Design a binder for these strands. Structure first.
Ligand SMILES: Nc1ncnc2c1ncn2[C@H]1C[C@H](O)[C@@H](COP(=O)(O)OP(=O)(O)OP(=O)(O)O)O1
Ligand SMILES: [Ca+2]
Length: 271
DNA sequence: ATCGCACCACA
DNA sequence: GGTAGCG
């Protein structure tokens, strides 16, 4: 309700300022106008944010289908620097943004940090929710450079999803509370930043309303490194004669792309 | 013309 | 509260 109030008050602030093939492809200046269009649309359409030429993090918002988006995106000629918008209150996969500064952390073995993180999360999902999974259900995406160990993990739980990304965040700050206290041996998550201050390997700042999350094969606009399937990745989509593996990987990586299932379990976690 | 949320603060 | 620095 509070969220409903501030969101509409921002829109009040903004008010103060020969058949062709079926294709939906609309751009908007305000992310709220994009969602207005989505609700009005009646086709399974989703919101993307495109970083426009700048150093700025300014975005325009694109509205289309996953299938049509991929069609114009997959060559990586255009639509560089693209972001998934994780809609508030939509069911979503459990995901992670993991990063640490490599010079500031000469001892850290990032590969083992993800493997031990995944194991603890899988134990947490079993103990708290009865969900059984393993690293074979984790899509491992890498955007690392020589300065930064950067990885995105997207869990592919069978017939399971979280109520929305706020609840993913509540679930994570609950199970990571021992780690947040070093600020059952979760010390392997603590890392130094540039200024020597210890933080977590797990970035807790991405579980926010309408969080932008950088697409598979997109780079930040300043940069050249794009998210790509990590070498050690152990999640493999079932192969299909009807879709390319790369499209399979794309759809798995979309946090809001919850597999339509008739037996779906929805996980909640309250603060 | 993006968006939506730790560290200080006063009292 | 009260914001600006962050993601
Ligand atoms: N200025 C911004 N405006 C809107 N959304 C943002 C902004 N900065 C970051 N985000 C969103 C998109 C990012 O994918 C997500 C995680 O932040 P961040 O770690 O800085 O980027 P990243 O994980 O995609 O790349 P990196 O490899 O640099 O860590 O938060
Ligand atoms: Ca990151």
């Amino acid at each position: 309700m509070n969220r409903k109030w501030e969101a509409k008050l921002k829109q009040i602030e903004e008010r103060a300022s020969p058949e062709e093939p079926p294709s939906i492809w609309r751009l908007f200046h305000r992310q709220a106008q994009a969602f207005n269009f989505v609700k009005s649309c009646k086709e399974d359409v989703h919101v993307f944010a495109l970083e426009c030429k700048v150093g700025d993090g300014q975005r325009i918002y694109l509205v289309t289908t996953y299938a049509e988006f991929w069609f114009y995106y997959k060559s990586r000629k255009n639509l560089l620097h693209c972001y998934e918008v994780i809609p508030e209150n939509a069911v979503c996969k459990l995901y992670f943004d993991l990063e640490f500064n490599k010079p500031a952390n000469p001892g850290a073995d990032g590969k083992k940090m993800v493997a031990l993180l995944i194991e603890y999360v899988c134990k947490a999902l079993q103990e708290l929710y009865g969900v059984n999974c393993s690293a074979e259900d984790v899509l491992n995406l890498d955007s690392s450079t020589d300065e930064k160990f950067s990885r995105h993990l997207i869990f592919q739980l069978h017939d399971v999803a979280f109520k929305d990304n706020i609840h993913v965040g509540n679930f994570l700050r609950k199970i990571l509370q021992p780690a947040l206290d070093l600020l059952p041996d979760l010390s392997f998550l603590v890392v130094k930043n540039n200024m020597g201050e210890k933080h977590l390997f797990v970035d807790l700042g991405v579980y926010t309303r309408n969080r932008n999350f950088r697409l598979y094969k997109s780079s930040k606009i300043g940069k050249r490194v794009a998210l790509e399937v990590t070498e050690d990745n152990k999640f493999f989509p079932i192969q299909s004669k009807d879709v390319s593996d790369e499209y399979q990987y794309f759809l798995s990586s979309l946090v809001s792309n919850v597999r339509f299932s008739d037996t779906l379990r929805i996980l909640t976690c309250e603060p």
